[PDB]
Amino acid sequence: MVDAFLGTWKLVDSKNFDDYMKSLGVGFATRQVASMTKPTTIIEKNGDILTLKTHSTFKNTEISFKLGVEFDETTADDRKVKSIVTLDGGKLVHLQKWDGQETTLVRELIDGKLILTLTHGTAVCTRTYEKEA
Numbered sequence: 817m818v819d820a821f822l823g824t825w826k827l828v829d830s831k832n833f834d835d836y837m838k839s840l841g842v843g844f845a846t847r848q849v850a851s852m853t854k855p856t857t858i859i860e861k862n863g864d865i866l867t868l869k870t871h872s873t874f875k876n877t878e879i880s881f882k883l884g885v886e887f888d889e890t891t892a893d894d895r896k897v898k899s900i901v902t903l904d905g906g907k908l909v910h911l912q913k914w915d916g917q918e919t920t921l922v923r924e925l926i927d928g929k930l931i932l933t934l935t936h937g938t939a940v941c942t943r944t945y946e947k948e949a
């Protein structure tokens with residue numbers, strides 16, 4: 817049900833990522849490098865386990881999860897969170913919880929592009945990824 821999300825994706829547009837990072841308490845120097853970084857996101861499946869890799873010249877991350885089953889995660893900015901990823905309205909919705917805080921990472925396909933919407937506090941960031949062959 818997730819299959820159109822699978823593959824290798826490259827960042828091609830970013831709006832309000834600094835706002836999002838600052839809301840999370842990321843320091844200025846990290847925000848500065850991150851603002852010029854273009855990650856590659858690789859989404860693969862093996863049975864109902866999904867692996868999501870984010871690779872860049874700055875930070876790399878990898879998570880594996882079953883849809884609808886909570887997992888522990890340590891984010892790129894070193895938050896230790898309780899996470900769950902589900903399909904909702906055809907969107908891949910990743911909710912992270914820690915210290916009573918929450919943030920959502922929502923992925924939706926629009927005209928073949930992967931749109932990642934990141935919300936924390938009032939900050940709303942929209943990052944667009946395009947498929948690599």
Ligand SMILES: CCCCCCCCCCCCCCCCCC(=O)O
Pocket residue numbers: 827837842846850853855857870871872874875876877891892893932943
């Ligand atoms: C792994 C590369 C992530 C993007 C560059 C480094 C950012 C580090 C500080 C902010 C981390 C916030 C949580 C992760 C944001 C992921 C954004 C994305 O996948 O495009």
